[PDB]
Write a protein that binds this DNA or RNA. Structure first.
Ligand SMILES: [K+]
Ligand SMILES: [K+]
Ligand SMILES: [K+]
Ligand SMILES: [Mg+2]
Ligand SMILES: [Mg+2]
Ligand SMILES: [Mg+2]
Ligand SMILES: [Mg+2]
Ligand SMILES: [Mg+2]
Ligand SMILES: [Mg+2]
Ligand SMILES: [Mg+2]
Length: 65
RNA sequence: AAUAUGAAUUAAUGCGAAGUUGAAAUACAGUUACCGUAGGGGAACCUGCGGUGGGCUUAUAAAUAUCUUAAAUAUUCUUACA
């Protein structure tokens, strides 16, 4: 329900105004490299041929009981 | 002297039925049982001394618990970013 052009933004409009900022501006200034994101293990798993000892070790697979 | 036989005479024991006097054992069996040994008692048994567990491992709380960006940021994310 858009608000009148004279009235201030509603709570819903502020949320959509923030979502617009999040897509464009919020990620300006730098990119992030070589940082582990937990979700990417599930959604971007590597292929078996590209797995290294380093990758297995980074995941903690070597830590037994 | 040995072997065999019978033997006066005399000792131990099994089974069978079948009651009698008690109630010793199996449960904490109503006094823990049993082993060795000694004494005593109608009968099982009772008592002393040490031993054994084939009886007590059957074992189960005097309680007290802590601070960093709660999110425009983690929570979403589908091979993308890099
Ligand atoms: K007895
Ligand atoms: K005895
Ligand atoms: K005795
Ligand atoms: Mg008696
Ligand atoms: Mg008795
Ligand atoms: Mg008894
Ligand atoms: Mg006596
Ligand atoms: Mg005794
Ligand atoms: Mg017993
Ligand atoms: Mg026992």
């Amino acid at each position: 329900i858009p608000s009148a052009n004279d009235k201030p933004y509603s709570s819903q409009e502020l949320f959509l105004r923030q979502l617009n900022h999040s897509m464009r501006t919020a990620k300006l200034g730098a990119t992030i490299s070589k940082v582990y994101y937990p979700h990417k293990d599930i959604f971007y798993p590597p292929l078996p041929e590209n797995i290294t000892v380093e990758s297995l070790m980074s995941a903690g697979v070597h830590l037994g009981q």
